[model samples]
Target: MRIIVIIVTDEQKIEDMWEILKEIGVDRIVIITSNKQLAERAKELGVDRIFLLTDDELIAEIVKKLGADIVFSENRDIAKKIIRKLKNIIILSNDEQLVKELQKEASDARVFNVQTKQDFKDLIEKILEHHHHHH
Candidate 1:
């Protein structure tokens, strides 16, 4: 019953992430993409909860309706900007510096970092299995 919000600033990761999520059997995903390609792929995979950035609308506005439990992104700028709207959800990123800064700046924020692609997959796997319950 958990929702995952993915901000697709880094297009390279989203493709792999979709495959990983499917393999792990986590279907509750809300993806926001900047262009049509990712959106089409998500739709092709039957991921209905997709928001495409066709105009100049901000992600913070889109995030309002997401009610996301976990916010995942690979870009530091997107991650930092998103925390303003989403305060409590676990924000996942590969940028260690961004994670540290977000954690420090926002006391209630729970930010996680992974150095490798495999590490990211492992961490997401743990999260999906409810094994990494950090309190």
Candidate 2:
């Protein structure tokens, strides 16, 4: 029900993120910058998904390229971009109002946030269960 696209800010986080998402068998990811070094590293890790994020217009292009709708982002603007495409966005925000706002803007959007890795693992498993049960 989800192809999670992770947004990262730096090289170290990219490495950490790659190691983590791999454990769960997720294949999609996106970076909001033009950092070839980081992109190349992700390439080495076997994530071949491609999406450009240099600007607002390019955001649409990226979505079209990856055919990606699911996202877990730390950036509000990035989420907005995904929503503008009328695609499902999986965002991380502890703010309940913000989550509702995003859902209101785009009905397919889902918002989640957890405090730790254990919490995240539990959260994702729960989402997966609920998603499967409904679908």
Kindly list the per-residue Cα lDDT of model 2 for residues 1-135, writing each as its tens digit.
335555564423533344665555444445444566756766677665644455644654565556666554455565566567645545675445566677777766666654456666687687555222233
Error of 2 at 64 (Å): 3.6
| TM agreement with the true structure for every prediction | 0.69, 0.57
- After superposition, the stretches of candidate 2 with alpha carbons farther than 4 Å from their true spots are 10-33, 51-53, 93-97, 114-119, 127-135
lDDT of 1 by residue, 15-51 (tens): 4345566544346677676778867877887776788
* TM-score of candidate 1 versus the correct structure, residues matched by position: 0.69
Judging by lDDT against the true structure, name the best candidate.
1
Query: Cα deviation of 43 in candidate 1 (Å)?
Result: 2.0
Query: lDDT per prediction?
Result: 0.68, 0.56
